[PDB]
Design a protein around this ligand. Structure first.
Ligand code: AKG
Length: 366
């Protein structure tokens, strides 16, 4: 009875939503997309939303829409999924990786400010694991220097920062991937407060068109539209958001309590006021403190039928980036990269499950 680190919360509502779309005969981008965009604006408090085929696609067209390319620099942490780095590189721009807080894994204003040059054209903070980054300080940097801020909110559907939802202002990109807080297997959405930018996003995700028979390419774009079939599933999940996040939050609490009697070190919560979406429950496994390495712990758990994730192996430690940036050193990122792992955490997780994990942890924890 394998216990994976994540499971989608799929039930009768998701199936019913698909049945309705299949029965209507309008299966690709249409009214369900328009509805999902309207719901994300209502959810966040922002003015415009562009649904896409994934958050990676959303990042690609966001950077593309800013006109980022050869000669430009984009500040981002290395502690994030490589898709952001890849999109910066593939547009022909230069990623400038900066370090993160040692216990929250979030990019600091200091690390960002120190990397700013006249070539910096975007700053991409990540709301890590469900908690929010220090937006007030980051936007201030953005405004002082005239640099766009594009928030990676793939872990943050349901996250709040100092009384306001992530995505309420500025530009934020959410993900509907299978292990994310809400899902339609693959999908994402770009929420923004800028109408000209939103218009560019809509065109770039659909062939650069301004479909009608005499529609025409205004400027070449990609194909990243989200089918209504998947959009309807996302809408069904979005309706369940509070209950689903409430279950993750409760399980995070037990983990917290359980960790008191264990040597593994969970992340620290940011100091600012916030609401945590609890996308992941990450722990650090330092061999000298725990007696076991991170890799050994993950493999031990797997033997016990317990799955774990690794979010993330820092971008700068992966082949292409190691060879392109050989002298790049980011201590707090590397320290965590060698020691983090994500424990089972999903809305349908039971106590049999939970307790199964903790019992495996004690078995291995000394
Ligand atoms: O299954 C996918 O399409 C992507 C999975 C992913 O990005 C991940 O490693 O977390």
């Amino acid at each position: 009875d394998f216990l994976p680190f994540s499971r989608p919360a799929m039930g009768a509502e998701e199936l019913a939503a698909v049945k309705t779309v299949l029965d209507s005969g309008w299966i690709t981008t249409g009214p369900k997309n328009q509805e999902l965009e309207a719901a994300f604006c209502r959810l966040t408090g922002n003015q415009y939303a562009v649904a896409v085929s994934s958050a990676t696609a959303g990042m690609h067209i966001a950077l593309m829409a800013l006109g980022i390319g050869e000669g430009d620099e984009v500040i981002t942490p290395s502690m994030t999924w490589v898709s952001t780095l890849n999109m910066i590189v593939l547009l022909g721009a230069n990623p400038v990786m900066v370090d993160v807080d040692r216990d929250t894994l979030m990019v600091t204003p200091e690390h960002i400010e120190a990397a700013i040059t006249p070539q910096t054209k975007a700053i991409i903070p990540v709301h890590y694991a469900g908690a929010p980054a220090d937006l007030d300080a980051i936007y201030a940097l953005g405004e002082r220097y005239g640099i766009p801020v594009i928030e990676d909110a793939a872990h943050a559907t349901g996250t709040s920062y100092k009384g306001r939802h992530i995505g309420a202002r500025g530009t934020a990109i959410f993900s509907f991937h299978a292990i994310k807080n809400i899902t339609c297997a693959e999908g994402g959405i770009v929420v923004t407060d800028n109408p000209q930018f939103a218009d560019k996003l809509r065109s770039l995700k659909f062939h650069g068109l301004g479909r009608a028979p005499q529609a025409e390419v205004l400027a070449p774009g990609y194909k990243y539209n989200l089918p209504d079939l998947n959009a309807a599933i996302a809408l069904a999940q979005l309706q369940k958001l509070d209950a689903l996040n409430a279950r993750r939050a409760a399980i995070a609490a037990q983990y917290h309590q359980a960790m008191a009697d264990l040597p593994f070190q969970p992340l620290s919560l940011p100091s600012w006021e916030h609401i945590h979406a609890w996308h992941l429950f990450i722990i650090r496994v330092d061999e000298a403190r725990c007696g076991i390495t991170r890799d050994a712990l993950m493999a031990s758990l797997k033997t016990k039928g317990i799955g774990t994730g690794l979010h993330f192996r820092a971008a700068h430690t992966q082949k292409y980036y190691r060879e392109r940036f050989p002298t790049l050193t980011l201590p707090d990122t590397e320290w965590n990269s060698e020691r983090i792992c994500s424990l089972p955490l999903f809305p349908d997780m039971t106590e049999s499950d939970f307790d199964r994990v903790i019992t495996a942890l004690h078995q291995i924890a000394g």
